[PDB]
């Protein structure tokens, strides 16, 4: 079990501005054998099943607008959204994947200001 903490629990940003979310782990998520940090990020649109945005941290899943970008290394990771649209409202969920009992972080939210 890994305690996952997201710095903001609610973000109000006007359109055209960047919104950043910090998810800090409780232990190291870096798999020593390969040297890859195994973190994941999911967006659950209002009344929809969540999709995937950032597999690992640097990488980005297909079918995803280029604005989303993952950052950070060693238990403190961060997303960035260069331009926020009306469709970016949702419930961003950072989850670790290193250890088998996968634990999501508490759900953050992003509402248009």
């Amino acid at each position: 079990h890994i305690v996952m903490t997201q710095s903001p629990l609610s973000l109000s940003v006007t359109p055209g501005q960047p919104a950043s979310i910090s998810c800090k782990s409780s232990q190291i998520s870096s798999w020593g054998s390969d040297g890859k940090t195994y973190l994941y990020w999911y967006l659950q649109k209002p009344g929809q099943s969540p999709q995937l945005l950032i597999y690992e941290v640097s990488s980005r899943f297909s079918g995803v607008s280029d604005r989303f970008s993952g950052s950070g290394s060693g238990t403190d990771f961060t997303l960035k959204i260069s331009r926020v649209q009306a469709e970016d409202v949702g419930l961003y969920y950072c989850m670790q994947g290193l250890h088998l009992p996968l634990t999501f972080g508490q759900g953050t939210r992003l509402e248009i200001k």
Partner: protein, 122 residues
């Protein structure tokens, strides 16, 4: 193009059993390691159980250990989640998820099912 559909969600009194079926299409189902996922309303997503590509490497979470059974049937392209000793806390909408096609983790989520809600009360 992947399509995951759920079935089996219904109202039930505590203690009684229920089996949840995840029919999948659009990919070779037999060469994958399916997961189960859930989320109570107003709460975050919670992991439930995993069945690997080889049918003999099942795992479950702590809060649901020794109470749930996960099983795949390759031929019928469905995922069976037999849940016993259900309680009003365990009720939630259940999501059936796929594995990561591109990546290194043996366990990850590419695509989420539509989602079925199971209601538990007296």
């Amino acid at each position: 193009q992947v399509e995951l559909v759920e079935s089996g969600g219904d109202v039930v009194q505590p203690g009684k059993s229920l089996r949840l079926s995840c029919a999948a299409s659009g990919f070779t189902f037999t060469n994958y390691a399916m997961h189960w996922l859930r989320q109570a309303p107003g709460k975050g997503l919670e992991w439930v159980a995993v069945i690997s590509s080889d049918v003999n490497d099942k795992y479950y979470a702590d809060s649901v250990k020794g109470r749930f059974t996960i099983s795949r049937d390759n031929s019928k392209n469905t995922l069976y989640l037999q849940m016993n000793s259900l309680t009003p806390e365990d009720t939630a909408v259940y999501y059936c998820a796929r594995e990561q096609a591109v990546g290194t983790n043996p366990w990850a989520f590419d695509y989420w099912g539509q989602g079925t809600l199971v209601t538990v009360s007296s």
